[PDB]
Design a protein around this ligand. Structure first.
Ligand SMILES: Cc1ncc(COP(=O)(O)O)c(CN[C@@H](CCC(=O)O)C(=O)O)c1O
Ligand SMILES: Cc1ncc(COP(=O)(O)O)c(CN[C@@H](CCC(=O)O)C(=O)O)c1O
Lengths: 408, 410
């Protein structure tokens, strides 16, 4: 058979397996082959399940209709996003934090921004991540060439600072033990642990990044699930604007997982070591490597940031928060050390003395419930299982009775 | 003032200037500053201007509505795209060329795929491009670390094979003078020249790639504007499936420039030197770095690939083609050497003894018409201006009468 003479990207070769979530989907498929008549309930991938509020979808349908009129048609937008949408995001989420409209970059969601930001930083930066954390930070790092080889002994790529977040440290890194890196990806409330950093901790994090001369990439995907009195934006920490940017999404707020709309904020005062503004390189990436978020998605996001839209999102979030309570109560009633599930739609359940992957297989096997194994979120996740709360109420309740029977 | 200790990405420093189209938009902004009441006609950026056909927007509006019901709501999709849409694209554009549903990757547009493909190839490959060509191939290449610095004497980035496409060579390079690279980006019908490679030239292109062990990234963004009897897909060339992938989009077919939907096709027989299939690395990129095209944009694309959609897309394309004729006739009456416009919605006009940027500025200042300087598409574009045919009819007519008024007495 014919082969080209092009060498495979050696960074792609470094990757230890496929992406976590397709891997889980494979395993659930194999389970449906074994049990063809099983009633599978997925609490694995954190995908929203409830309909998008009408006020928002009417806004999208109206934009679609308008595209068939001479007056309403629009083509290429500003790749940063429509100005009224940047303004609404700037006012609504960062009002009083000194963020301008021109600091907001509208995207087709946060996973894409994470990789666009990794392209921008390039192959010579080193990164630190929460351990455990959402696997896209590590995987994108490997793909960009920022890392060594995977070491199977410790279960870690070389050259990544894994910042262990444990029950014994309150799921916040011990910063006095953390090596300096260029970038620090920091997710709060955290996926998978559910842990939301306090004001004092985030203060420490800014002080840490300021002294090490690092950039924090603050992932606030779950901030509007906040219950405790904790900061929802890193820019609430004075001095954050010199060391941090923030990336977020409408996915978990308006059910936009399929619709695709997020943003990144890069403050004017965030500068590389030569004084060059980081935002200006992001802007170049965004103009060259992207052609803007869908116009219909942007019209849906615009409608989200209005009194009716905010009320609708609060209702949605509230509903998933009530699912989370149900799951928490179940596991606590069962005598588990269960974490998170207060400030986030994830509960982080401790299964000590078992490997995550084995617990995943066991639950899937006995209860036809998909979970996500903790060690898919890095080596600090070993021994835990993340349980997602996105589901119809009846599905959540049924999964919980199934757990009660397995584990009684 | 405070600065971090993070070193700016050296590949970002390499970029000689801002991306082409924002730089034009800046100049048009400054123009409207100077003359706030100028009726600017924009033929710079190639943006669709006519309404999306009702059949396509009704489908999108329906998906939006369905998203508010328990039954019709959907969240994350298969990252490659909805299986029915992948099938429709495979059958509709590649039916009979051996392309499977699973070789199609639905994206939010071709610009985005180009850059995801470049992340996939990585920093250690060398590329070739047509010269002139759509500036995203070269810019994404610089950004990814594939290049040396910009050399202002020759107006080229180091380590890129710039393949000369001229009126004299029929806008197809002499491949005997083209050095071996890993990757060859090839656009046909080409942006900016409008030139469509014949079956004979594409066969040569494929034979060249096969003997060199190169991968062709074939960009078919304008293939449905074909008038001549030329291949619309690289996979029409036997053996293309061992050396070639293809990228395209609905932007120019249904006016989806703002909606955002295209696709890349990578065939199963495309392998790296170690035997690894290139599509398996792309799939990983697509799973890690992307979360799918918008579900509403997918519903719109699915509606385009029906008898009613194809009929609507064909009609809109033909409209822009008549615009292109008006523009061609205008410049040829004024005695310019003018290329393209046959197989593409672009007219490539030569201005002897003038820089492209000076011509751009001159047209913009005197007629309030925006164009794109040919040097924006690389050094072979120097001396040319690209005139986009996208616009309302009356605006193309007005632009053309402005050109004639300016240039008739010279
Ligand atoms: C921390 C974090 N950042 C970013 C994203 C991606 O946001 P989008 O705007 O919708 O791109 C997610 C969703 N993570 C889910 C879904 C799986 C995935 O993102 O690959 C999860 O962790 O199960 C997330 O949890
Ligand atoms: C050859 C070619 N490939 C890809 C694209 C991008 O397609 P999308 O699906 O809409 O992402 C264009 C449109 N280029 C236009 C618009 C400017 C730009 O693409 O940056 C042009 O060249 O004027 C193109 O001309």
């Amino acid at each position: 058979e014919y082969k080209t003479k092009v060498s495979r990207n050696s960074n792609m070769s470094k990757l230890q397996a496929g992406y976590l979530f397709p891997e889980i989907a494979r395993r659930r498929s194999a389970h449906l082959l074994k049990y063809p008549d099983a009633q599978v309930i997925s609490l694995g991938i954190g995908d929203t399940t409830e309909p998008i509020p009408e006020v928002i979808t009417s806004a999208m349908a109206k934009k679609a209709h308008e595209l068939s009129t001479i007056e309403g048609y629009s083509g290429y937008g500003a790749e940063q996003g429509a100005k009224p949408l940047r303004a609404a995001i700037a006012k609504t989420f960062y009002g009083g934090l000194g963020i301008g409209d021109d600091d907001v970059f509208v995207s087709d969601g946060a996973k894409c921004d994470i990789s666009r930001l990794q392209v921008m930083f390039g192959s010579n930066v080193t990164i630190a991540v929460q351990d455990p954390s959402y696997p896209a930070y590590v995987d994108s790092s490997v793909i960009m060439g920022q890392t060594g080889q995977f070491n199977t002994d410790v279960q870690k790529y070389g050259n990544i600072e894994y910042m262990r977040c444990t029950p014994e440290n309150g799921f916040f890194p011990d910063l006095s033990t953390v090596g300096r890196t260029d970038i620090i990806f920091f997710c709060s409330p955290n996926n998978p642990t559910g842990a939301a950093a306090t004001r004092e901790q985030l203060t420490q994090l800014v002080e840490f990044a300021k002294k090490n001369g690092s950039i924090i990439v603050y992932d606030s995907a779950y901030a509007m699930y906040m219950s405790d009195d904790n900061p929802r934006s890193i820019f609430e920490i004075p001095g954050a604007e010199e060391v941090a940017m923030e990336t977020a999404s409408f996915s978990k707020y308006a059910g936009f997982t399929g619709v695709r709309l997020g943003w990144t904020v890069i403050p004017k005062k965030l500068l590389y070591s030569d004084g060059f503004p980081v935002a200006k390189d992001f802007n170049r990436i965004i103009c060259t490597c992207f052609n803007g978020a869908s116009n219909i998605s942007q019209a849906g996001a615009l409608a989200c940031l209005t009194p009716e839209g905010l009320e609708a999102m609060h209702k949605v979030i509230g509903f998933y928060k009530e699912n989370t309570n149900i799951i928490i109560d179940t596991f606590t009633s069962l005598g588990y050390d269960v974490y998170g599930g207060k400030n986030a739609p994830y509960v982080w359940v401790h299964f000590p003395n078992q490997s995550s992957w084995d617990v995943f297989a066991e639950i899937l096997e006995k209860t036809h419930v998909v979970t996500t194994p903790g060690s898919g979120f890095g080596p600090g996740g070993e021994g835990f299982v993340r349980v997602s709360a996105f589901g119809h109420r009846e599905n959540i309740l049924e999964a919980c009775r199934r757990f009660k029977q397995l584990y009684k």
